[PDB]
Amino acid sequence: DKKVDLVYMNWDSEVASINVLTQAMKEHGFDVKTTALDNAVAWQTVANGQADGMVSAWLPNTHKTQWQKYGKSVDLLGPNLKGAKVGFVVPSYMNVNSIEDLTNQANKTITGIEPGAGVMAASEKTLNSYDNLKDWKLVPSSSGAMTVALGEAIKQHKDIVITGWSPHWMFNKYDLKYLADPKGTMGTSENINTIVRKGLKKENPEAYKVLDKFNWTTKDMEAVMLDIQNGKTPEEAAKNWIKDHQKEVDKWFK
């Protein structure tokens, strides 16, 4: 009776990863349950032992608030995707190249996602750290609302500054660039990590080993996200990537 209970958040990056892992585990005989939750709630759920784990911990800086609160109540298994990043992203036609260069562009507004995301906390730290951003403000919306706003700005050739991150499909759709962050307040060496509930190793060893071994690359996640943007369901997008990289996937289960 193989069994696993996973949580994830509503970011295009984590929809791809949770669907890839879920389908892989299903093909190897696991009964898999998944639940989409707010950032802080996903962390709390694993910390209470109501979920077995998640593969969506952006560390060290992005989810530092959650790590300070819940870090002692979970088992950090380590990076599953190396070399991720967060920062202020602008269209490449904008003349500014650094966060220090921003003055009165884009109505002095940072276009954000949902208030509970880690990138929003880092954005608020950034607004208080750079003196030139004194009169600026972070406006929350959502993951989906941000990309829709990015598209409309670009059609009109507007100034816009968004709370962006990699991996994300938008870099292969629009011509964008990260603003330099010499103070490093948006994070500097982020990885996407796997965490599991304490006791999983002992109680559910089969699930623990798979979750411990799970890993893939920026390009792999980009590939799955790409399919979802072009009309494929997350399930069939996950299945397509697994088939294409079957021997890579098999390594998680040995």
Which spans of this chain sit near Cl ion (rule: CB under 5 A)?
A: 63, 65-66, 77-78, 80, 118, 194
41 annotated among ligand-binding-site residues: no
Q: Shortest gap between Cβ of 115 and Cl ion (angstroms)?
A: 11
Which is nearer to Cl ion, 166 or 193 (by Cβ)? 193
Sign of CA dihedral 201, 204, 206, 208: negative
Which is nearer to Cl ion, 77 or 242 (by Cβ)? 77
Cα three-residue angle 26-28-31, rounded to 5 degrees: 40
* Tokens 């796997």, residue located: 194
Which is nearer to Cl ion, 178 or 208 (by Cβ)? 208
Q: Where are the beta strands (DSSP E) in the chain?
A: 3-8, 31-36, 53-59, 74-91, 109-111, 137-139, 162-166, 176-178, 190-197
- Which one-letter amino acid corresponds to residue 25? M
Q: Buried b vs exposed e over 93-121: b needs ≥16 C-beta within 10 Å?
A: ebebeebbebeebbeeebbbbbebbbbbb
83 annotated among ligand-binding-site residues: no
Q: Around Cβ 139, how many Cβ atoms within 10 Å?
A: 12
Of all residues in this chain, which one has the CB nearest to Cl ion in the complex?
A: 118
Which is nearer to Cl ion, 82 or 108 (by Cβ)? 82
Task: For residues 242 and 245, give the distance between their C-alpha atoms in angstroms, rounded to a whole number.
Answer: 5
139 annotated among ligand-binding-site residues: no
Q: Shortest gap between Cβ of 192 and Cl ion (angstroms)?
A: 10
Which is nearer to Cl ion, 23 or 44 (by Cβ)? 44
Q: Shortest gap between Cβ of 119 and Cl ion (angstroms)?
A: 8
Q: Shortest gap between Cβ of 215 and Cl ion (angstroms)?
A: 6
SS3 label, residue 189: coil
Q: Shortest gap between Cβ of 21 and Cl ion (angstroms)?
A: 11
Cite the annotated binding site for glycine betaine by residue number: 63, 118-119
Cite the annotated binding site by residue number: 63, 118-119
